[PDB]
Scaffold this motif. Sequence first.
Motif, PDB file in Angstrom:
ATOM      1  N   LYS A  28       0.892  -1.084  -0.015  1.00  0.00           N
ATOM      2  CA  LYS A  28      -0.044   0.015  -0.056  1.00  0.00           C
ATOM      3  C   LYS A  28       0.859   1.458  -0.052  1.00  0.00           C
ATOM      4  O   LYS A  28       1.929   1.280   0.737  1.00  0.00           O
ATOM      5  CB  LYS A  28      -0.935   0.118   0.964  1.00  0.00           C
ATOM      6  CG  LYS A  28      -1.636   1.370   1.318  1.00  0.00           C
ATOM      7  CD  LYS A  28      -3.200   1.431   1.262  1.00  0.00           C
ATOM      8  CE  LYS A  28      -3.859   2.773   1.016  1.00  0.00           C
ATOM      9  NZ  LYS A  28      -5.160   2.727   0.505  1.00  0.00           N
ATOM     10  N   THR A  29       0.510   2.164  -0.827  1.00  0.00           N
ATOM     11  CA  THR A  29       0.997   3.545  -0.859  1.00  0.00           C
ATOM     12  C   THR A  29       0.248   4.553   0.091  1.00  0.00           C
ATOM     13  O   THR A  29      -0.752   4.587  -0.068  1.00  0.00           O
ATOM     14  CB  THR A  29       0.996   4.094  -2.200  1.00  0.00           C
ATOM     15  OG1 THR A  29       1.428   3.287  -3.163  1.00  0.00           O
ATOM     16  CG2 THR A  29       2.055   5.245  -2.335  1.00  0.00           C
ATOM     17  N   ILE A  32       2.904   9.930  -0.820  1.00  0.00           N
ATOM     18  CA  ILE A  32       3.798  10.515  -1.897  1.00  0.00           C
ATOM     19  C   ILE A  32       4.068  11.831  -1.624  1.00  0.00           C
ATOM     20  O   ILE A  32       3.226  12.594  -1.214  1.00  0.00           O
ATOM     21  CB  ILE A  32       2.992  10.429  -3.173  1.00  0.00           C
ATOM     22  CG1 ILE A  32       2.712   8.873  -3.440  1.00  0.00           C
ATOM     23  CG2 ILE A  32       3.871  11.024  -4.171  1.00  0.00           C
ATOM     24  CD1 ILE A  32       1.583   8.939  -4.859  1.00  0.00           C
ATOM     25  N   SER A  55      -6.041   8.555   1.681  1.00  0.00           N
ATOM     26  CA  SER A  55      -7.390   8.896   2.343  1.00  0.00           C
ATOM     27  C   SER A  55      -7.638   7.738   3.597  1.00  0.00           C
ATOM     28  O   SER A  55      -8.456   7.897   4.577  1.00  0.00           O
ATOM     29  CB  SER A  55      -8.625   8.915   1.526  1.00  0.00           C
ATOM     30  OG  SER A  55      -9.202   7.816   1.349  1.00  0.00           O
ATOM     31  N   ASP A  56      -7.527   6.518   2.990  1.00  0.00           N
ATOM     32  CA  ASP A  56      -7.678   5.311   4.003  1.00  0.00           C
ATOM     33  C   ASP A  56      -6.541   5.134   4.708  1.00  0.00           C
ATOM     34  O   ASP A  56      -6.613   3.959   5.689  1.00  0.00           O
ATOM     35  CB  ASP A  56      -8.205   4.134   3.328  1.00  0.00           C
ATOM     36  CG  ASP A  56      -7.652   3.563   2.199  1.00  0.00           C
ATOM     37  OD1 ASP A  56      -7.745   2.391   1.643  1.00  0.00           O
ATOM     38  OD2 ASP A  56      -6.450   4.460   1.778  1.00  0.00           O
TER      39      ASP A  56
ATOM     40  N   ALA B 109     -12.025   3.626   0.066  1.00  0.00           N
ATOM     41  CA  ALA B 109     -10.724   3.822  -0.016  1.00  0.00           C
ATOM     42  C   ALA B 109      -9.956   4.653  -1.085  1.00  0.00           C
ATOM     43  O   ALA B 109     -10.901   5.148  -1.939  1.00  0.00           O
ATOM     44  CB  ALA B 109     -10.099   2.397  -0.163  1.00  0.00           C
ATOM     45  N   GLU B 110      -8.818   4.705  -1.039  1.00  0.00           N
ATOM     46  CA  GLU B 110      -8.042   5.529  -1.882  1.00  0.00           C
ATOM     47  C   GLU B 110      -6.839   4.681  -2.504  1.00  0.00           C
ATOM     48  O   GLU B 110      -6.025   4.313  -1.414  1.00  0.00           O
ATOM     49  CB  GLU B 110      -7.628   6.883  -1.295  1.00  0.00           C
ATOM     50  CG  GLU B 110      -7.210   7.827  -2.481  1.00  0.00           C
ATOM     51  CD  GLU B 110      -7.167   9.238  -1.891  1.00  0.00           C
ATOM     52  OE1 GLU B 110      -6.884   9.536  -0.766  1.00  0.00           O
ATOM     53  OE2 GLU B 110      -7.224   9.910  -3.149  1.00  0.00           O
ATOM     54  N   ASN B 111      -6.616   4.751  -3.540  1.00  0.00           N
ATOM     55  CA  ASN B 111      -5.199   4.186  -4.026  1.00  0.00           C
ATOM     56  C   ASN B 111      -4.686   5.091  -4.888  1.00  0.00           C
ATOM     57  O   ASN B 111      -4.863   5.575  -5.901  1.00  0.00           O
ATOM     58  CB  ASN B 111      -5.766   2.949  -5.204  1.00  0.00           C
ATOM     59  CG  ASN B 111      -5.911   1.558  -4.499  1.00  0.00           C
ATOM     60  OD1 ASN B 111      -5.411   1.396  -3.470  1.00  0.00           O
ATOM     61  ND2 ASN B 111      -7.040   0.960  -4.784  1.00  0.00           N
ATOM     62  N   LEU B 112      -3.453   5.612  -4.107  1.00  0.00           N
ATOM     63  CA  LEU B 112      -2.665   6.668  -4.712  1.00  0.00           C
ATOM     64  C   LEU B 112      -1.913   6.184  -6.078  1.00  0.00           C
ATOM     65  O   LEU B 112      -1.470   4.993  -6.139  1.00  0.00           O
ATOM     66  CB  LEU B 112      -1.815   7.167  -3.709  1.00  0.00           C
ATOM     67  CG  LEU B 112      -2.234   7.853  -2.461  1.00  0.00           C
ATOM     68  CD1 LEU B 112      -1.202   8.500  -1.588  1.00  0.00           C
ATOM     69  CD2 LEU B 112      -3.030   8.857  -3.149  1.00  0.00           C
TER      70      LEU B 112
END
Lengths: 204, 409
Positions: A28-29, A32, A55-56, B109-112
């Motif tokens: 998981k990123t 950044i 966000s999560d 959720a968020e996937n950057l």
Amino acid sequence: AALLQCTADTLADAVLITTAHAWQHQGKTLFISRKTYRIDGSGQMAITVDVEVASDTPHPARIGLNCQLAQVAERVNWLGLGPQENYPDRLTAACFDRWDLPLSDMYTPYVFPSENGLRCGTRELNYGPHQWRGDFQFNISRYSQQQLMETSHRHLLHAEEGTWLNIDGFHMGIGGDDSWSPSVSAEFQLSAGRYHYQLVWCQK
Amino acid sequence: PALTEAKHQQQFFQFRLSGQTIEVTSEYLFRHSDNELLHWMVALDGKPLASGEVPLDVAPQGKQLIELPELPQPESAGQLWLTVRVVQPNATAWSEAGHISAWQQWRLAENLSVTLPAASHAIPHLTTSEMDFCIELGNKRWQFNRQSGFLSQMWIGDKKQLLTPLRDQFTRAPLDNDIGVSEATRIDPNAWVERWKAAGHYQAEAALLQCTADTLADAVLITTAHAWQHQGKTLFISRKTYRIDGSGQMAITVDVEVASDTPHPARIGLNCQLAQVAERVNWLGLGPQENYPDRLTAACFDRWDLPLSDMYTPYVFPSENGLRCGTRELNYGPHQWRGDFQFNISRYSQQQLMETSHRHLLHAEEGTWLNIDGFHMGIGGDDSWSPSVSAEFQLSAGRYHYQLVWCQK
């Protein structure tokens, strides 16, 4: 951290560095970080930081930079809120002015050690031949966050090699409504998702 | 549009999300959820991945738990959102069948995105007149006026794209609330508008502090700095960077400083008049109705597509309107903008609006007016004859930063 990119370029009046890193964990990123460093003929280094936060992921305690300086000085001088330790949700008593203290005073000897000594709303900070300008919060002492985090009693810490410097673009509140639950108000959490900050570093 | 905000805040069902479970709460005192269907659905940046339906069975003032089926764990980057709606299958005496009575959404959720743009086989070509700077790349061209310091025109092919240069904007066509008078007779020096006026917000003059161009290995870089002043006072400072790469994308970066002693500005963004005029408007953000910072709870984050007409709110007494917030992608014509902003778009300049007293007197302007806001002040309404915008909604930070990407197809 993972380097996504790093580049250098020559401009007419300066040199320009560009980086991008990602912090991950188990695929998981979390964050950044994108920066620019710009060095000019006047020997000033301007830094620009732009961060993205998933966000999560839980809101992080802070957003800044750090490093260990080789040098060690007597005083600390700044233009910001002071003179005592102050945090975002605990800074009403503080005053905006020009402060000068001994390094020692920049540290809070809480018996049980942790993050401490912060000062907010700082525009200019001076230590040694160095100078930093912008709009930040910082702390400075001889102990790494790691040391602090790993030592249970004040009496067991020992000064580290140089000077540890933490420069925060942003920092989470500290709470205290109670100490056995999450007591940091929402207005004090780093929940924006995107953060931006800048700095200038020079010497005399 | 307000009506919707009302509808939503007044809904009789309340939701809580816990894990994969939804908690429903009934605000009915006397009836049972006997004409209620709960539809749910998951989407990634607008792309729907899963949807469901569940009938409600809640007693007045009771709770109902809703167990969610294993949710999709997309790899792709973006925002994952969950949305629920309440539907009335059967008609009622005051409602049609399939009426929506309540809704709610959540960001799961968020996937950057960690990806990088692939190499371009070329890079833009800079040309320096005395009057300006020219960036070329294929059919594409951009021009920055050297005395104004603004992006003055751009072409695709041989077609100009703007009727007006792109520039900073700090004001708005006052809202009733901004004007805040209850009696034609009595004017409030404290009204926002009053203050803004007096401060010269409406008539400050931009001043180029600096404008530079540079060629990088992979792009061209433009740098500007302007100051807005009024009677010797500097109200704002705007510093930008424009970066054009081999892919023909223009990235903008804005950083603004606002004098602590000036009244908080209505907004912080840019604007320009586009030459083109299209039918639809498509975006990924909050919608679909007009929404403002302090009035956007009823709005949903999704992908919307409407006719330009719908992007305008015909308030009898005209003012700033049609805004949509929390937008990440906006499409109009061959254009596309990306970032995180709020915007509005129509055929009327803010000036026109501000100067016309009745809706019936406005007339479409030449192309399309576009307002892109990095930030925008709340609208208030606690009352309309005093400053009713809460502090959390004022642009009081002193420093603002925003970014954008502009391209074409």
